[PDB]
């Protein structure tokens, strides 16, 4: 019932479940935290910005890797108007045989990609599932830099 | 071990084990005292 809202002693003394709920919803309101100065505020915001950019780059790297690994980017290059892009494969134990058959695309059940990443990456000059892997590797390196 | 075994190795791992340990840690942390 203590020590969770480390940034707020008023919440940490709450004997109810409201402390847990308000601890989540006030975690990023740095200006209202206990023992707070402006320098610490700007420094924490700066570090949070770095972590956020790292998260964005990791998300993009994950999209690239999953298109490279479980997608049909190379097949889509040769026939972009008939082949439907694949986002990533599906492994869900709750599937029946009918669901597996219906979601089956090429070798495994997979989700069609509605993000338009296939067309975007094709336009900027990507033609191989090894070009996407290089992008994922580089973006994970950039995320490490930002962290 | 082929690459197609990775989903069956990772999806249960992440989607069940990570919730369990994360719940353990979060409950322990939010139920601490001083």
């Amino acid at each position: 019932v203590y020590k969770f809202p480390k940034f707020s002693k008023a919440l940490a003394e709450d004997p109810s479940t409201r402390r847990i709920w308000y601890g989540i919803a006030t975690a990023h309101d740095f200006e209202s935290h206990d023992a707070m100065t402006e320098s610490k505020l700007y420094q924490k915001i700066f570090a949070s910005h770095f972590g956020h950019i790292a998260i964005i780059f990791l998300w993009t790297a994950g999209n690239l890797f999953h298109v490279a690994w479980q997608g049909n980017f190379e097949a889509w290059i040769l026939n972009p108007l008939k082949v439907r892009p694949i986002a990533h494969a599906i492994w869900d134990p709750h599937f029946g045989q009918a669901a597996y058959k219906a979601f089956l695309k090429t070798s495994s059940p997979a989700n069609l990609a509605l993000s338009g990443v296939y067309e975007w990456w094709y336009t900027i000059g990507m033609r191989t599932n090894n070009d996407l892997y290089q992008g994922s590797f580089f973006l994970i390196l950039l995320s490490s830099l930002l962290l | 071990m082929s690459l197609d075994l990775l989903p069956s190795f990772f999806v249960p791992l992440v989607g069940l084990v990570l919730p369990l340990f994360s719940i353990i840690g979060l409950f322990l942390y939010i139920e601490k005292e001083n």
Binding site: K3, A47, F50, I140 | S2
Partner: peptide, 30 residues
């Protein structure tokens, strides 16, 4: 089709990015 080595080293590099993330997470304090 990417190889096992390609996926494995990407997983290893992802682990390194994870240790860098907790270091940033712990440095942003409890």
């Amino acid at each position: 089709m990417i190889y096992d080595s390609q996926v494995y080293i990407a997983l290893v590099i992802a682990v390194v990015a994870s240790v860098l993330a907790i270091r940033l997470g712990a440095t942003l304090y409890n």
